[PDB]
Amino acid sequence: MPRFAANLSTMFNEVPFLERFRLAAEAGFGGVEFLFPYDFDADVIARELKQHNLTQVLFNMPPGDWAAGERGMAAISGREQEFRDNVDIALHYALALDCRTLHAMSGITEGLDRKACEETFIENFRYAADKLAPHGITVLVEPLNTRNMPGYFIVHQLEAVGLVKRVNRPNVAVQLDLYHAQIMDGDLTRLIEKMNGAFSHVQIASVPDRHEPDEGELNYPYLFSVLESVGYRGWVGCEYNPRGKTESGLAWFAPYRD
Ligand SMILES: [Mn+2]
Numbered sequence: 033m034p035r036f037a038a039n040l041s042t043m044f045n046e047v048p049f050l051e052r053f054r055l056a057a058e059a060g061f062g063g064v065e066f067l068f069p070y071d072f073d074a075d076v077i078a079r080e081l082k083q084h085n086l087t088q089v090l091f092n093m094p095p096g097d098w099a100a101g102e103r104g105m106a107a108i109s110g111r112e113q114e115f116r117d118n119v120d121i122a123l124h125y126a127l128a129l130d131c132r133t134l135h136a137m138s139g140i141t142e143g144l145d146r147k148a149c150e151e152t153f154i155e156n157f158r159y160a161a162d163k164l165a166p167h168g169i170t171v172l173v174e175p176l177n178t179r180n181m182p183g184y185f186i187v188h189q190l191e192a193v194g195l196v197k198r199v200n201r202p203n204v205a206v207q208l209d210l211y212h213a214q215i216m217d218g219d220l221t222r223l224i225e226k227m228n229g230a231f232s233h234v235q236i237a238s239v240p241d242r243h244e245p246d247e248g249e250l251n252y253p254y255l256f257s258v259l260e261s262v263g264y265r266g267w268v269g270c271e272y273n274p275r276g277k278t279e280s281g282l283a284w285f286a287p288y289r290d
């Protein structure tokens with residue numbers, strides 16, 4: 033059976049962020065993920081994890097000015113020192129939370145020169161890989177989709193696999209969010225099979241409405257069986273927006289809880 037991590041940025045929003053750790057643990061999650069811890073003290077989040085017996089599975093490096101529309105800078109020429117400084121900040125939190133996996137966001141690159149962007153991506157990902165390797169931490173690239181994130185740098189799975197091969201660092205891989213993969217690429221069983229050994233994290237949400245993985249066009253129980261068949265033993269992040277109250281939606285998770 034796969035192991036599932038509650039996404040505390042999208043789930044349990046009935047309560048403030050710090051209260052979500054307890055609710056996830058009481059719902060039977062052993063792991064959590066979220067986008068950004070940076071508005072909270074690392075020591076406080078560490079204590080949330082310890083007190084509620086939770087593993088920190090994933091979070092993102094600083095994205096730049098989110099309020100101003102920034103969605104990362106890994107692929108934006110000229111922001112390299114900024115990106116490098118943000119790796120230090122992400123590493124501080126990753127060590128505090130004993131987190132082994134970090135997503136480095138690439139940015140909105142529409143209207144920029146594609147070759148310059150890809151070159152900057154490679155340099156930045158190599159730097160991150162080199163800084164994180166001593167700590168056994170992996171950095172990920174996550175393809176998004178053009179409906180939810182128009183103009184984003186990377187929106188196709190095998191293209192991302194190709195970019196990672198160019199990076200040429202063992203602690204770099206793809207974050208495979210099946211919601212995004214279904215919207216942009218499709219052919220998910222054969223895609224997972226082609227990508228086997230090249231993705232270190234998986235995320236799920238219904239398609240097209242991004243709710244619990246028990247509705248919509250994908251048969252998620254089948255896809256769980258595919259992940260198992262290929263020997264995936266990472267975590268599966270629940271990055272969905274609950275239809276209603278978070279816990280009222282958790283029947284799908286009943287077979288997997290604890
Ligand atoms: Mn995602």
